[PDB]
C-alpha cells in the first residue's frame, strides 16, 4: 500500500513540474517573438534616421 | 538589454525543470528486481537546498 501511494505522489510531482515547464516554454517563445518584433521596430526607426539626411 | 536578461533567467529555470523531470521519471521507473537496487549512506538527510513548496 505505501509503495502504491508513493506511485501516486511521484506521478503528481511529475505532472506539477511538467506543467511548470510547459508554461515556461510558452513564456520563452513569447519573449523570442517579442524580441524579434522590437528589434525589427528599432531597425525601422534607425533606417528612418537615414531619411533625415537627404 | 533588459529582455535578454529576462530570457536568460527563464532559460536557466527551464533547463533545471527539464532535467529535474528527467531524473524524476528515472526515479519513478525504478522498482524491485533492478540492478541499481542497493543500500545507501544517509538517504533520509535534509539537503543543502531544502527549497519547500
Amino acid at each position: 500500500w505505501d509503495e502504491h501511494d508513493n506511485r501516486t505522489r511521484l506521478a503528481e510531482r511529475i505532472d506539477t513540474v511538467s506543467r511548470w515547464k510547459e508554461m515556461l516554454d510558452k513564456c520563452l517563445t513569447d519573449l523570442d517573438a517579442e524580441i524579434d518584433a522590437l528589434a525589427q521596430m528599432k531597425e525601422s526607426a534607425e533606417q528612418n534616421l537615414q531619411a533625415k539626411n537627404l | 538589454f533588459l529582455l535578454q536578461e529576462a530570457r536568460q533567467r527563464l532559460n536557466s529555470d527551464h533547463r533545471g525543470k527539464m532535467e529535474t523531470l528527467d531524473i524524476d521519471r528515472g526515479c519513478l521507473s525504478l522498482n524491485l528486481t533492478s540492478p541499481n537496487i542497493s543500500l545507501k549512506i544517509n538517504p533520509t538527510r535534509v539537503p543543502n537546498g531544502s527549497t519547500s513548496l
Binding site: 509503495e3 | 525504478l30 524491485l32 533492478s34 543500500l39 545507501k40
Partner: peptide, 18 residues
C-alpha cells in the same frame, strides 16, 4: 523480501539528491 523493499526505498531517496 523486506530488505529488498528497504533497498528500493533507499535508492529512491538517494536518486532525488542529484
Amino acid at each position: 523480501r523486506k530488505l529488498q523493499n528497504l533497498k528500493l526505498c533507499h535508492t529512491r531517496l538517494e536518486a532525488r539528491t542529484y
